[PDB]
Chain A
Amino acid sequence: AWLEGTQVKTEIVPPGRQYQMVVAKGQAEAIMQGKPAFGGFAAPEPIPSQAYARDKLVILDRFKTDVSHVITVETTAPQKIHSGITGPLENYKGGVQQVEFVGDRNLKIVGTPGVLPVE
């Protein structure tokens, strides 16, 4: 998932740090139904489109059929992460910052899911 020959850091980030997280169809349904249906990966920068989620964040169709929603998550306690650059997989280029949550997922949603434009 990570860019070869780049450093993947392990960090602890404080509470109140926010990330953008693409969520699949049933995942977003669970979120709307009060479940903490958080995946392991997010992004520190805005996620502008589904095409970006696919090509830049390398969120594979095999894992998330539907990437039409994005949520804001916020850390609720100190949170271990991996931080680094996405690597290419399949015919996707990667090349943007992502974080992976390590261990406990001390997250909460901020607001409601947003819609990702296809392009």
Chain B
Amino acid sequence: MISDFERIREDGKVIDENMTVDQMIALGWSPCRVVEARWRWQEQLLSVVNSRGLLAIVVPDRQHLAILWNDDDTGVAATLYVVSGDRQQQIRIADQLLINGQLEAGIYSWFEQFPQVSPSIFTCMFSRQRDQAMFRVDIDASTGDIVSIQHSR
């Protein structure tokens, strides 16, 4: 299982798991990119590092991470990956989605958590490229496959 999950900001400050936004503000922190996510699996410390920035969550099954990986210097372009807890395998999640019969390019933008029937499901918010409409995309980390897409606002 995934333990001791820590996100390290470019300025070195460490975000503990489930540290809240209000706790960060109360410490006097400004927004800052996260350049490393680190965690324990069995007897190993594992990490992913991106100097361009990344957004990482532990999937509630505690055996996958969802990693939104910045692809350039802007913080916008990004690719979503599901990484196994032992960090040995990963899957790139599709960001060209069939929406109303049309193949739609877009960009994964941030994570949210909704009630789910399985802890293996996480949610990533998807910005459709052609009109920036937001879609909630639920993904089963145990298979690496999209479960459902719903228009959001």
Contacts and interface: CB of A to CB of B under 8 A. Distances in A.
Contacts, number: 83
Contacts of B112: 24-27, 65
Interface of B: 7, 9-10, 15, 21-22, 24-25, 29-34, 53, 55, 68, 75-76, 109-114, 123, 125, 131-134, 136, 152-153
A3 to B, nearest CB: 16
Contacts of B25: 32, 112-113
A69 B132 CA distance: 22
A109 B112 CA distance: 20
Range for the number of chain A residues in contact with chain B: 20 to 34
Nearest to B74: A36
Contact of B133 (A27, A40, A69, A113): A40
Contacts of B110: 26-27, 29-30, 35, 37
A86 B112 CA distance: 25
Most A CB contacts (10 A, CB to CB) among B31, B75, B111, B131 go to: B31
Contact of A34 (B22, B32, B131): B32
A112 B25 CA distance: 8
Most B CB contacts (10 A, CB to CB) among A104, A112, A115 go to: A112
